[PDB]
Amino acid sequence: SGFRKMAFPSGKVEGCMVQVTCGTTTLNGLWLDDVVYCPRHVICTSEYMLNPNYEDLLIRKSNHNFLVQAGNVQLRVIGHSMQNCVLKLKVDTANPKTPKYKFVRIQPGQTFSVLACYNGSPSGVYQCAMRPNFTIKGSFLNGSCGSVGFNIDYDCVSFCYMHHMELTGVHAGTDLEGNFYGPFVDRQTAQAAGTDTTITVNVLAWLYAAVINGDRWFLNRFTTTLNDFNLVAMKYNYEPLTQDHVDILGPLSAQTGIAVLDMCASLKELLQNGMNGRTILGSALLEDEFTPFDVVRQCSGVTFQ
Amino acid sequence: SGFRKMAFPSGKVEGCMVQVTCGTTTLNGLWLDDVVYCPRHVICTSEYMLNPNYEDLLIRKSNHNFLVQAGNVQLRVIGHSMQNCVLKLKVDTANPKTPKYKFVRIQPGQTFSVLACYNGSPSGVYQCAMRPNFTIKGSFLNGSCGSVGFNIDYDCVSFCYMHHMELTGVHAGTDLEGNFYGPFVDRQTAQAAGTDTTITVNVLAWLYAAVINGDRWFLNRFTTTLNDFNLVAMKYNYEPLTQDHVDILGPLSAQTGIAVLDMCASLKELLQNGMNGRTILGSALLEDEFTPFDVVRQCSGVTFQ
Ligand SMILES: *C(=N)[C@H](C[C@@H]1CCNC1=O)NC(=O)[C@@H]1[C@@H]2[C@H](CN1C(=O)[C@@H](NC(=O)C(F)(F)F)C(C)(C)C)C2(C)C
Ligand SMILES: *C(=N)[C@H](C[C@@H]1CCNC1=O)NC(=O)[C@@H]1[C@@H]2[C@H](CN1C(=O)[C@@H](NC(=O)C(F)(F)F)C(C)(C)C)C2(C)C
């Protein structure tokens, strides 16, 4: 028993991190087979940090302008190209530590692990959710660009995020094909994140985790309808709940014998009256960065290798 | 910027996890050079799960009773011995993935990462603190025994924890020499954790992290004395603050220009009046599982390789 913000083991990804230097800019890259992936703004110098034309900047470079290091070994760049906002650097050596992988684009509300890196070197791992406004609430310092987000399925690493920029306290990036999450661009403009909402299906999953772990004080006997719940969710900046979400919560409903709509009636009460000085799983706020699948995984015990 | 419960990258430890089966009991072991370390209660069968004599149980075993698997490869046991509460299994092959390591015993209030494993297979990584009552608030299911806790110093893995048992919602274990943290034994008796307290130096470190990240609302102009603070800390089940703690907080005081005793005056107010519906770094409770060193590491950017 117990419940923790749990990240995926990072070993399979640590073996792919490299350092990429171009000019006076150093950041992180992802080395899979004979391609190094990294943010394209590594080719930016401070004259262009505000309104760059990346096609122009790339044509003025040659392979020898790119310093790529895997620890201490140097990798020789034999070709470069741009795919949207990422740079793909072809190198002379296929990474022997390349895991089975795929590139997936995730949806708001889904969670992943982040391997924060500096100078090609892994620094720490943490779990986070893609927010409904397409930012993540990460922890990133200067030089963290190119750090990646990932999930693990059995033996397969799904890469879903590469870090590009911080926007007033929160973080924005692309999928691994170089397409940004959200309406952001990789230059200095007046862009801000839009209004964030609370991920309702995740809050419900977390309440089920609490019941599984013995926190029952917030339950009640009343139920409610999808439409009467969503009426109250809207007033509190909670995402509306769909039939798809109810079905997703099925396994947790089955394991605890509490109906989804029953649990929604508890959530309704918590939103109207607050916690009144009680905590749930050691939190005094309603937590929305665990998916139904995170809860099953942690309250059932799925491993990977 | 940002602040997350961040764990160490786990790659160096994932390579040491093996599965150990004896009888119908399977759990995890740690394979370093040609020794596999695992909890000694793997030699327990349900007749002895309550009052075992481990010396007797061990003498009735031979090397062939121990099934050790590193993924799919089998390791041949060529010797066994007991050190306090751990079993040391000598095997015929030195682990080629053995990192530079040491065995350290940590103190209450210190943090470490836990690699939760099942059947020798890594499942997830999370960060936690050793509580003042010598338990940890972990997340562990059946079969997690032998999972280890660790820190990383530059290139060196310090192993500090091996998981043995759950006691009413919290978790207890040994250092890697087999000596239990706290007054617990590896059998079924009527043992419970003692009263827990809040780790004050860690709360102060977390308040400095908040200031570094722009949360300033709780500051005030008043200061206080060590003895007047500790007078109020006692009433709230907070650990007393020493001059050693003040010195440890020096770097954070320097970086924010707020004196430790100044920050204590803010903590004093928060304890007497509560948060009054405000949050700090996304929490509505005072967080005590970040050390001063965790905060520096995350708000300065130290890596490892
Ligand atoms: C990559 N190495 C850094 C890491 C950033 C900064 C601290 N934490 C992070 O996540 N990223 C950058 O330097 C990117 C890069 C130019 C500027 N930039 C920023 O992150 C800046 N933000 C913005 O561009 C803004 F404000 F418009 F959102 C900064 C002010 C330094 C936070 C480019 C090409 C966007
Ligand atoms: C190791 N594989 C498990 C993992 C435990 C149980 C679920 N979460 C964990 O951390 N550990 C055990 O099976 C140990 C082992 C016998 C019983 N035990 C327990 O954890 C039990 N607790 C106690 O002994 C108690 F209550 F006294 F504290 C259990 C009731 C199953 C939680 C031995 C040798 C202590």
XYZ file of C-alpha atoms and ligand atoms in Angstrom:
680
model
C 0.000 0.000 0.000
C 0.925 3.716 -0.166
C 0.710 6.140 -3.076
C 3.544 8.211 -4.547
C 4.123 10.378 -7.601
C 5.976 7.580 -9.386
C 8.101 7.953 -12.536
C 9.216 5.269 -14.978
C 12.716 3.828 -14.500
C 14.926 5.908 -16.708
C 17.794 3.537 -17.608
C 16.657 2.918 -21.196
C 16.624 6.679 -21.889
C 19.798 7.660 -20.028
C 21.718 5.644 -22.643
C 20.421 7.902 -25.431
C 21.284 11.326 -24.061
C 24.080 13.271 -25.733
C 25.391 16.808 -25.670
C 25.087 18.986 -28.800
C 27.083 22.187 -29.181
C 26.800 24.619 -32.059
C 28.590 27.922 -31.636
C 28.372 29.012 -28.010
C 25.058 27.148 -27.463
C 25.132 23.728 -25.799
C 22.037 21.665 -25.074
C 20.856 18.060 -24.994
C 20.044 15.707 -27.826
C 18.422 12.305 -28.203
C 20.585 9.705 -30.015
C 18.602 6.813 -31.554
C 20.268 4.574 -34.184
C 22.416 7.009 -36.241
C 20.263 10.142 -35.732
C 20.610 12.767 -32.990
C 17.403 14.765 -32.380
C 17.612 18.178 -30.731
C 15.782 21.534 -30.651
C 16.451 23.594 -33.770
C 17.170 26.774 -31.791
C 20.641 25.382 -31.043
C 21.573 27.084 -34.362
C 20.470 30.466 -32.962
C 22.917 33.175 -31.950
C 21.763 36.070 -29.782
C 21.266 38.343 -32.816
C 18.455 36.030 -34.036
C 17.024 34.935 -30.650
C 13.946 37.132 -31.346
C 12.900 36.749 -35.015
C 15.018 34.028 -36.613
C 14.684 32.527 -40.045
C 15.771 28.962 -39.404
C 15.981 27.971 -43.070
C 18.589 30.729 -43.573
C 20.507 29.806 -40.424
C 20.647 26.138 -41.387
C 21.970 26.705 -44.928
C 24.912 28.739 -43.546
C 26.016 25.737 -41.441
C 28.067 22.677 -42.342
C 28.389 19.332 -40.575
C 31.611 20.448 -38.857
C 29.800 23.289 -37.062
C 27.973 20.692 -34.871
C 29.811 19.278 -31.836
C 28.092 16.105 -30.575
C 29.470 14.227 -27.547
C 28.245 10.947 -26.056
C 29.858 11.279 -22.653
C 33.473 11.683 -23.725
C 33.358 9.977 -27.131
C 32.773 12.385 -30.011
C 30.224 11.587 -32.714
C 30.969 12.672 -36.277
C 28.073 14.481 -37.980
C 27.676 13.310 -41.585
C 24.413 15.067 -42.452
C 21.827 17.431 -41.021
C 18.232 18.359 -41.748
C 15.288 20.124 -40.159
C 11.915 18.567 -39.373
C 9.575 21.311 -38.163
C 11.103 22.503 -34.862
C 13.654 19.723 -34.388
C 17.054 19.278 -35.977
C 17.987 15.769 -37.116
C 21.767 15.228 -37.116
C 22.974 12.150 -38.956
C 26.080 10.743 -37.255
C 28.566 8.058 -38.260
C 27.787 5.607 -35.419
C 24.512 3.911 -34.546
C 23.842 4.088 -30.801
C 24.398 0.504 -29.541
C 22.147 1.244 -26.533
C 19.129 2.100 -28.751
C 15.983 0.601 -27.170
C 12.829 -0.467 -28.906
C 11.040 2.864 -29.276
C 8.300 4.827 -30.956
C 7.263 8.464 -31.299
C 3.777 9.242 -29.998
C 1.895 12.474 -29.518
C 0.004 12.532 -26.229
C -3.275 14.275 -25.330
C -4.004 16.731 -22.496
C -4.499 14.873 -19.229
C -2.045 12.104 -20.059
C 1.037 11.686 -17.867
C 4.689 10.937 -18.653
C 8.113 10.896 -17.045
C 10.700 13.594 -17.732
C 14.428 12.926 -17.647
C 15.911 16.346 -16.918
C 19.428 16.648 -18.388
C 22.254 19.184 -18.521
C 25.219 18.935 -20.926
C 24.055 15.524 -22.073
C 24.088 14.281 -18.459
C 20.974 12.975 -16.643
C 20.135 15.011 -13.530
C 16.746 13.761 -12.275
C 13.487 12.069 -13.169
C 9.964 13.217 -12.342
C 6.382 12.577 -13.401
C 4.066 15.222 -14.849
C 0.865 15.676 -16.840
C 0.221 17.505 -20.111
C -2.130 20.296 -18.999
C -5.357 21.142 -20.881
C -3.647 24.342 -22.029
C -0.760 22.273 -23.584
C 1.919 23.316 -21.086
C 3.586 21.176 -18.427
C 4.450 22.288 -14.889
C 8.027 21.056 -14.995
C 11.284 21.833 -13.248
C 13.893 23.057 -15.729
C 16.945 25.349 -15.531
C 19.023 26.934 -18.268
C 20.549 24.276 -20.488
C 17.720 21.745 -20.041
C 16.503 22.063 -23.663
C 16.404 18.749 -25.486
C 15.447 16.827 -22.311
C 12.726 14.328 -23.220
C 9.465 13.000 -21.795
C 8.539 9.344 -22.163
C 6.347 6.412 -21.146
C 7.270 2.699 -21.105
C 5.013 -0.047 -22.540
C 6.407 -3.459 -21.573
C 9.810 -3.133 -23.296
C 9.025 -0.190 -25.619
C 9.914 3.448 -24.875
C 7.321 5.869 -26.264
C 8.914 9.309 -26.607
C 6.276 12.015 -26.404
C 7.968 15.291 -25.423
C 11.112 17.302 -26.067
C 11.700 20.417 -23.977
C 12.116 23.780 -25.784
C 11.217 26.814 -23.623
C 9.841 28.231 -20.381
C 6.879 30.660 -20.514
C 6.330 32.492 -17.213
C 6.769 29.599 -14.838
C 5.512 26.771 -17.078
C 7.135 24.768 -19.854
C 6.445 24.148 -23.539
C 7.804 21.730 -26.084
C 7.223 19.567 -29.114
C 6.576 15.968 -29.921
C 9.555 14.160 -31.437
C 8.458 15.015 -34.977
C 9.049 18.664 -34.033
C 5.421 19.816 -33.794
C 4.692 22.029 -30.796
C 2.150 21.123 -28.154
C -0.127 24.154 -28.003
C -0.052 27.413 -29.996
C 3.583 28.262 -29.229
C 6.571 29.091 -31.463
C 10.309 28.753 -30.793
C 11.149 32.456 -30.754
C 10.861 35.436 -28.398
C 7.376 36.930 -28.819
C 4.514 37.940 -26.502
C 3.076 34.421 -26.150
C 1.440 33.240 -22.921
C -0.284 30.066 -21.812
C -4.065 30.107 -21.897
C -6.351 29.375 -18.954
C -5.737 26.008 -17.312
C -8.499 23.691 -16.097
C -8.547 20.753 -13.667
C -8.465 17.262 -15.209
C -11.640 15.718 -13.758
C -11.173 12.086 -14.800
C -7.759 12.197 -13.078
C -9.218 13.623 -9.834
C -11.750 10.774 -9.763
C -8.981 8.211 -10.381
C -7.085 9.696 -7.415
C -10.174 9.467 -5.164
C -10.407 5.758 -6.038
C -6.711 5.395 -5.112
C -7.545 6.990 -1.748
C -10.343 4.482 -1.097
C -8.039 1.631 -2.067
C -5.578 2.977 0.519
C -8.135 3.423 3.327
C -9.119 7.120 3.027
C -12.937 6.917 3.050
C -14.104 10.000 4.942
C -15.338 11.909 1.860
C -17.735 9.214 0.624
C -21.500 9.636 0.926
C -24.618 7.705 -0.023
C -25.970 10.058 -2.714
C -25.278 9.740 -6.445
C -25.835 12.135 -9.346
C -26.174 12.345 -13.114
C -23.521 13.119 -15.687
C -25.357 16.345 -16.532
C -25.867 17.519 -12.963
C -22.215 16.843 -12.173
C -20.948 18.683 -15.275
C -23.212 21.583 -14.317
C -21.225 21.986 -11.100
C -17.843 21.103 -12.675
C -18.098 24.048 -15.056
C -18.476 26.513 -12.213
C -15.182 25.340 -10.713
C -13.051 25.222 -13.911
C -13.185 21.417 -14.068
C -13.241 19.640 -17.418
C -16.633 18.073 -18.247
C -16.981 14.338 -17.789
C -17.892 12.059 -20.692
C -19.200 8.532 -20.952
C -15.716 7.595 -22.209
C -14.230 8.736 -18.887
C -16.813 6.721 -16.932
C -15.870 3.585 -18.891
C -12.146 4.243 -18.351
C -12.784 4.319 -14.570
C -14.527 0.913 -14.795
C -11.685 -1.201 -13.379
C -11.391 1.065 -10.323
C -15.171 1.056 -9.795
C -15.086 -2.758 -9.962
C -12.207 -3.116 -7.487
C -13.771 -0.815 -4.864
C -17.476 -1.474 -5.475
C -18.187 2.261 -5.716
C -20.002 3.421 -8.841
C -18.425 6.219 -10.876
C -21.548 8.378 -10.548
C -21.500 7.605 -6.828
C -17.916 8.919 -6.610
C -18.943 12.007 -8.629
C -21.437 12.847 -5.879
C -18.505 12.887 -3.418
C -16.463 15.092 -5.746
C -19.466 17.393 -6.002
C -19.577 17.785 -2.254
C -15.802 18.365 -2.007
C -16.034 21.153 -4.593
C -18.960 22.891 -2.860
C -17.756 22.651 0.766
C -13.995 22.130 0.541
C -11.913 19.675 2.506
C -12.671 21.415 5.824
C -9.157 20.806 7.149
C -8.947 17.109 6.226
C -6.421 15.598 3.818
C -6.643 12.857 1.199
C -3.556 10.704 0.568
C -1.490 13.333 2.357
C -2.773 16.229 0.240
C -5.036 19.122 1.189
C -5.837 19.832 -2.498
C -7.537 17.670 -5.098
C -4.763 16.069 -7.175
C -5.232 15.764 -10.956
C -1.908 14.440 -12.317
C -2.637 10.694 -11.953
C -4.494 8.977 -14.816
C -6.792 5.979 -14.219
C -3.947 3.926 -15.662
C -1.327 5.372 -13.285
C -3.561 4.342 -10.355
C -4.093 0.775 -11.601
C -0.364 0.423 -12.288
C 0.598 1.568 -8.807
C -2.288 -0.204 -6.958
C -1.835 -3.522 -8.966
C 1.944 -3.693 -9.648
C 2.841 -3.759 -13.368
C 6.599 -3.934 -14.083
C 8.756 -3.523 -17.232
C 11.916 -4.931 -18.815
C 12.250 27.400 -12.716
C 9.598 25.076 -11.214
C 9.886 22.593 -8.360
C 9.100 18.872 -8.474
C 9.584 15.848 -6.242
C 12.613 14.709 -8.235
C 14.279 11.281 -8.018
C 17.761 10.258 -9.133
C 18.079 8.622 -12.565
C 17.862 4.934 -11.899
C 19.864 3.380 -14.768
C 22.902 2.465 -12.652
C 20.687 0.517 -10.218
C 18.352 -1.140 -12.728
C 21.384 -3.117 -13.946
C 21.828 -4.686 -10.497
C 18.335 -5.990 -9.831
C 17.781 -9.743 -9.895
C 15.056 -12.141 -8.865
C 15.682 -14.578 -5.983
C 13.429 -17.571 -5.403
C 13.697 -19.991 -2.513
C 10.840 -22.434 -2.111
C 7.587 -20.726 -3.050
C 8.914 -17.259 -2.060
C 10.212 -14.946 -4.786
C 11.534 -11.454 -4.140
C 14.195 -9.042 -5.364
C 17.921 -9.038 -4.787
C 20.799 -6.649 -5.382
C 23.671 -8.108 -7.466
C 27.024 -6.320 -6.987
C 30.255 -8.029 -8.146
C 29.687 -11.737 -7.312
C 27.328 -11.233 -4.330
C 23.520 -11.069 -4.394
C 22.023 -9.274 -1.364
C 18.418 -9.949 -0.384
C 16.158 -10.008 2.700
C 16.753 -13.088 4.840
C 13.032 -13.846 5.184
C 13.131 -15.333 1.673
C 14.092 -18.561 3.528
C 10.826 -18.421 5.509
C 7.917 -20.757 4.854
C 4.476 -19.948 6.241
C 4.989 -22.234 9.263
C 7.798 -19.919 10.485
C 6.411 -16.552 9.279
C 5.655 -15.658 12.941
C 8.570 -16.782 15.164
C 11.387 -18.040 12.945
C 14.862 -19.070 13.946
C 16.857 -17.991 10.920
C 20.067 -19.757 11.940
C 18.147 -23.070 11.910
C 16.430 -22.309 8.606
C 19.708 -21.396 6.925
C 21.592 -24.548 7.984
C 18.857 -26.749 6.442
C 19.439 -25.106 3.033
C 22.026 -25.785 0.345
C 23.173 -23.625 -2.559
C 20.834 -25.453 -4.961
C 17.762 -24.357 -2.977
C 18.319 -20.735 -4.185
C 17.041 -19.773 -7.653
C 18.637 -16.502 -8.820
C 17.748 -15.018 -12.226
C 19.209 -11.928 -13.900
C 16.451 -11.337 -16.416
C 16.499 -14.694 -18.179
C 20.079 -15.782 -17.454
C 20.400 -17.976 -14.369
C 23.114 -17.311 -11.794
C 24.706 -20.280 -10.040
C 24.900 -19.912 -6.246
C 28.265 -21.132 -4.938
C 27.963 -20.015 -1.312
C 25.569 -18.365 1.111
C 25.801 -16.582 4.439
C 23.768 -14.334 6.702
C 24.716 -10.822 7.792
C 22.174 -9.631 10.359
C 18.879 -9.398 8.425
C 20.264 -9.791 4.906
C 21.301 -12.924 3.062
C 24.498 -12.744 1.006
C 24.467 -15.225 -1.896
C 27.807 -15.814 -3.574
C 27.302 -16.503 -7.288
C 29.645 -17.711 -10.018
C 29.533 -14.541 -12.170
C 30.510 -10.993 -11.265
C 27.880 -8.510 -12.457
C 29.520 -6.697 -15.417
C 27.169 -3.726 -14.863
C 28.416 -3.154 -11.275
C 28.750 0.611 -10.680
C 31.060 2.360 -8.291
C 29.124 2.032 -5.039
C 29.175 2.237 -1.278
C 26.918 1.256 1.614
C 25.850 4.148 3.836
C 23.411 4.401 6.700
C 21.315 7.557 6.497
C 19.809 9.671 9.299
C 16.178 10.730 9.839
C 15.317 13.682 7.621
C 17.602 12.631 4.784
C 16.052 11.813 1.407
C 16.727 9.074 -1.155
C 15.271 7.528 -4.286
C 13.523 4.154 -4.248
C 13.531 1.809 -7.224
C 10.413 -0.292 -6.688
C 10.819 -3.757 -8.254
C 8.780 -6.928 -8.730
C 10.286 -10.283 -9.784
C 13.650 -8.645 -10.339
C 12.051 -6.139 -12.741
C 12.081 -2.348 -12.171
C 8.572 -0.878 -11.920
C 8.979 2.776 -10.868
C 11.168 5.330 -9.145
C 10.165 7.831 -6.470
C 11.749 10.082 -3.865
C 11.105 9.823 -0.127
C 12.504 10.822 3.258
C 13.514 8.698 6.245
C 11.007 9.823 8.892
C 12.053 10.736 12.462
C 10.359 7.522 13.597
C 12.594 5.463 11.190
C 9.831 4.488 8.757
C 9.351 5.670 5.180
C 6.023 6.544 3.547
C 6.584 4.441 0.452
C 4.464 2.746 -2.175
C 5.006 -1.017 -2.132
C 2.889 -4.063 -3.053
C 3.406 -7.740 -2.324
C 6.671 -8.944 -3.812
C 8.491 -5.600 -3.478
C 10.890 -6.871 -0.771
C 14.532 -6.413 -1.689
C 13.830 -3.155 -3.581
C 16.549 -0.653 -2.670
C 16.882 3.036 -1.828
C 19.858 5.038 -3.048
C 21.503 8.411 -3.641
C 24.035 9.339 -6.355
C 27.242 11.319 -5.655
C 28.869 12.296 -8.960
C 29.445 8.763 -10.314
C 29.019 6.795 -7.056
C 25.801 5.035 -5.997
C 25.307 5.102 -2.220
C 22.901 2.319 -1.247
C 21.112 3.181 1.974
C 17.901 1.130 2.169
C 16.555 -2.331 1.422
C 12.818 -2.907 1.769
C 11.604 -5.627 4.193
C 8.040 -5.064 5.485
C 4.945 -2.876 5.702
C 3.623 -1.851 9.151
C 0.098 -0.399 9.001
C 0.490 1.825 5.984
C 4.198 2.676 6.327
C 7.365 0.818 5.397
C 10.422 -0.471 7.250
C 13.756 -1.837 6.163
C 17.458 -2.188 6.780
C 20.665 -0.654 5.606
C 22.676 -2.868 3.261
C 24.620 -4.406 6.145
C 21.288 -5.846 7.322
C 20.699 -3.598 10.347
C 17.130 -2.346 10.673
C 16.242 1.326 10.685
C 14.217 1.763 13.864
C 13.243 -0.771 16.552
C 11.704 -3.311 14.163
C 12.317 -7.043 13.611
C 11.685 -9.208 10.537
C 8.910 -11.352 11.996
C 5.183 -11.095 12.745
C 4.787 -9.460 16.170
C 2.785 -6.549 17.617
C 5.225 -3.838 16.489
C 4.031 -0.374 15.450
C 5.734 2.816 14.358
C 6.181 5.463 17.022
C 4.934 9.043 16.813
C 6.150 10.935 13.755
C 7.281 14.567 13.802
C 7.720 17.190 11.070
C 11.276 17.748 9.797
C 11.735 21.481 10.447
C 15.004 22.100 8.598
C 13.363 20.561 5.505
C 10.269 22.806 5.784
C 12.543 25.862 5.912
C 14.499 24.615 2.873
C 11.184 24.275 1.006
C 10.141 27.836 1.953
C 13.428 29.083 0.463
C 12.642 27.099 -2.715
C 9.275 28.891 -2.828
C 10.934 32.316 -2.599
C 13.392 31.329 -5.313
C 10.375 30.431 -7.468
C 8.405 33.635 -6.774
C 6.070 32.614 -3.905
C 6.621 35.450 -1.401
C 3.237 36.035 0.228
C 4.127 34.406 3.577
C 7.174 36.575 4.310
C 7.080 39.264 6.994
C 9.464 41.788 8.512
C 9.777 40.272 12.006
C 12.497 37.840 13.097
C 12.837 35.619 16.165
C 15.317 33.683 18.277
C 16.240 30.027 18.084
C 14.711 29.514 21.532
C 11.469 31.364 20.866
C 11.007 29.468 17.608
C 11.682 26.063 19.207
C 9.194 26.994 21.926
C 6.471 27.184 19.278
C 7.815 24.258 17.197
C 7.369 21.877 20.120
C 3.687 22.685 20.419
C 3.132 21.651 16.800
C 5.181 18.397 16.763
C 8.033 20.013 14.817
C 11.618 18.944 15.435
C 13.688 21.577 17.289
C 16.089 23.657 15.242
C 19.822 23.661 15.962
C 22.674 25.943 15.026
C 23.826 23.143 12.696
C 20.558 23.438 10.753
C 20.942 27.226 10.500
C 24.435 26.786 9.026
C 23.179 24.137 6.576
C 20.594 26.661 5.289
C 23.383 29.223 4.705
C 23.611 28.862 0.914
C 19.850 29.391 0.540
C 19.912 32.398 2.889
C 22.752 33.854 0.793
C 20.987 33.314 -2.544
C 17.704 34.920 -1.417
C 19.007 37.515 1.053
C 16.573 36.316 3.727
C 18.093 35.394 7.080
C 17.313 31.953 8.499
C 15.885 33.463 11.693
C 13.873 35.819 9.492
C 12.385 32.816 7.652
C 11.674 31.129 11.016
C 9.454 34.088 11.913
C 7.408 33.335 8.766
C 7.204 29.649 9.673
C 6.061 30.689 13.136
C 3.213 32.683 11.679
C 2.210 29.868 9.286
C 2.016 27.423 12.202
C -0.099 29.750 14.370
C -2.556 30.999 11.712
C -2.443 28.398 8.941
C -2.265 29.030 5.227
C -5.712 30.681 5.162
C -6.576 29.154 1.787
C -3.313 30.051 0.023
C -0.852 27.541 -1.428
C 2.941 27.404 -1.572
C 4.577 25.749 -4.596
C 1.232 24.151 -5.395
C 0.754 22.674 -1.916
C -1.722 23.603 0.803
C 0.395 21.831 3.472
C 3.922 22.520 4.657
C 6.192 20.054 2.831
C 9.065 18.421 4.753
C 10.584 15.841 2.367
C 13.099 18.147 0.619
C 16.506 18.614 2.283
C 18.499 21.858 1.923
C 20.650 19.883 -0.500
C 17.688 18.714 -2.612
C 16.656 22.376 -3.016
C 20.131 23.571 -4.046
C 20.444 20.664 -6.487
C 17.121 21.424 -8.140
C 17.438 25.266 -8.001
C 21.148 25.227 -9.216
C 21.323 22.212 -11.593
C 23.831 19.532 -10.508
C 24.034 16.514 -12.857
C 25.667 13.047 -12.641
C 27.417 10.497 -14.857
C 16.873 25.687 -23.203
N 18.100 25.382 -23.029
C 16.257 26.825 -22.383
C 15.618 26.337 -21.071
C 14.515 27.250 -20.530
C 14.924 28.543 -19.798
C 14.905 28.159 -18.305
N 13.997 27.009 -18.271
C 13.659 26.533 -19.487
O 12.797 25.674 -19.713
N 15.290 27.510 -23.276
C 15.467 28.692 -23.916
O 16.515 29.349 -23.755
C 14.350 29.221 -24.824
C 14.923 29.468 -26.224
C 15.016 30.968 -26.428
C 14.486 31.651 -25.184
N 13.897 30.551 -24.383
C 13.242 30.653 -23.205
O 12.979 29.649 -22.517
C 12.783 32.055 -22.747
N 11.327 32.111 -22.857
C 10.726 32.604 -23.944
O 11.138 32.550 -25.104
C 9.379 33.301 -23.679
F 9.426 34.160 -22.640
F 8.991 33.985 -24.773
F 8.444 32.377 -23.410
C 13.293 32.489 -21.326
C 12.893 33.960 -21.096
C 14.820 32.351 -21.175
C 12.595 31.618 -20.260
C 14.077 30.147 -27.291
C 14.540 29.918 -28.721
C 12.563 30.263 -27.177
C 7.934 -8.410 0.771
N 7.897 -9.065 -0.324
C 6.622 -7.994 1.442
C 6.139 -6.602 0.998
C 5.235 -5.896 2.011
C 3.758 -6.329 2.105
C 3.008 -5.325 1.207
N 3.910 -4.169 1.178
C 5.126 -4.401 1.715
O 5.992 -3.546 1.937
N 6.852 -8.085 2.905
C 6.426 -9.066 3.739
O 5.727 -10.005 3.307
C 6.795 -8.992 5.226
C 7.517 -10.283 5.623
C 6.572 -11.096 6.486
C 5.285 -10.314 6.648
N 5.588 -8.983 6.069
C 4.776 -7.903 6.026
O 5.052 -6.909 5.328
C 3.507 -7.912 6.905
N 3.703 -6.952 7.991
C 4.164 -7.332 9.185
O 4.956 -8.248 9.414
C 3.631 -6.514 10.375
F 2.295 -6.333 10.334
F 3.936 -7.132 11.533
F 4.212 -5.304 10.380
C 2.161 -7.672 6.131
C 0.993 -7.878 7.115
C 1.987 -8.625 4.932
C 2.129 -6.213 5.630
C 7.859 -10.555 7.081
C 8.956 -11.584 7.303
C 7.864 -9.456 8.134
